[PDB]
Amino acid sequence: APSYRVKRMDIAKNDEECVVNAAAPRGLPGHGVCKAVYKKWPESFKNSATPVGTAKTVMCGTYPVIHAVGPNFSNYSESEGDRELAAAYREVAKEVTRLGVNSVAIPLLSTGVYSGGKDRLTQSLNHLFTAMDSTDADVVIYCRDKEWEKKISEAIQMRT
Template identity: 30%
Template sequence: MPFQIIRQDITKMQADAIVNAANTALQMGGGVCGAIFNAAGAQKMQTACDKLAPIQPGEAVVTPGFALPAKYVIHAVGPVYSPVELERCRELLRSAYTESLKLAKKHRCKSIAFPLISSGIYGYPKAEALEVAKQAIEAFLDEYEMEAYLAVFDKSAFVLSETLLGEVESYIDQHYVDAHQPKNRNLLGVESEALAYAAPSMPLPMMAPSAALDDLMERLDEPFSDTLLKLIDAKGKTDVEVYKRANIDRKLFSKIRKGHGYTPRKPTILALAIALELTLPETDDLLERAGYALSQASKFDVIVEYFIVNGRYDIFEINEVLFQYDQPLLGV
């Protein structure tokens, strides 16, 4: 997927490029910087950096990855946080991300992984640093195709609205059914309709049985890709707008669009539903086309359902909440 926030050691990531939160002298430091130097081979990395130093806050340079899994290390310098120069700090931090992405593009990288720049000894509040990172990365991905990862060690960067988290928690309390409780599975809509035809006491109104059955079978046979394309047209959106808002890459979207028997995974379908701003019944119908259904026994499903029911279609906001609950993210 184009942009994903993950909990992982950045030195072990298989991205084409990883970003080092560097200092202006490009000297080996502590924290993420020290870990990257050590994993790459400290002496070789320092020699390469010495040839490029110094650089200024907001700038970035690139070296080989040496012993790292990544081919390149992009060394970006963020600002030292100053609340009296907040706007300047934001500009420099945003530039550190943007310049890193430009270098990755220049070196034909298909993937890049960032730490949360300036959030360590440079003192940038993690929640504010995360917001700047998201804005810079999302803006770049609106124009260019690349997979971007933000590797964080813990959830402390995610200071979400207490009101939002409270509303989500309340919704979970009301709708989540513990999977260990015995219960009957809710029928899919098409299953309910099929049962209706088998029960004379439950006819579908306004339709002759043969016509109703023909209609049901026609809808069952419609490929998922055909339904998706119809929805895109009905919602007045473009393909590019949909796959970017769904946070999936162009190649995956093209595979889904062509069909040929390919069925995307449930998180991908829900990401498309969010991108299309579908209602809950429309989402249910789209899921049914691929053989899925929302379940009250799945906390993941209940959380996504909350956002759909409340008309909140920001996929990154949804993924932040899913991240808090240790759930899979939308788009993959």
């Protein structure tokens, strides 16, 4: 039965059937998660650029990389940013369904450098749940911060 889990580790080392990239705009290698994805699955960046609020899947071999471009809250208002963040996750759920995969590795979109200097764990996680609750896939959320793992883990347990 479909679950949610959280792991504090590099998503480029995930054990799931596909990976969501916290993609930088313009198809660029970016920083953080995006850069790790670029180093592990560079061929997935061929023609990967996609607008803020959307997702685009490129295969690396037969492994799907879902490039999801969340808004950068240094450039978006809070209301417009929230709408595009919600929409990016929606498009992730649509791609996961289309691919038919049994599991997916996801990072929290629009946190870190695309956060507008704000803690957006809860905002981004709740959009993740809303979108992925609509799918059948096992979801494994990948973070790096130890306090975030705790908070994510608590949220996962509050809905079981």
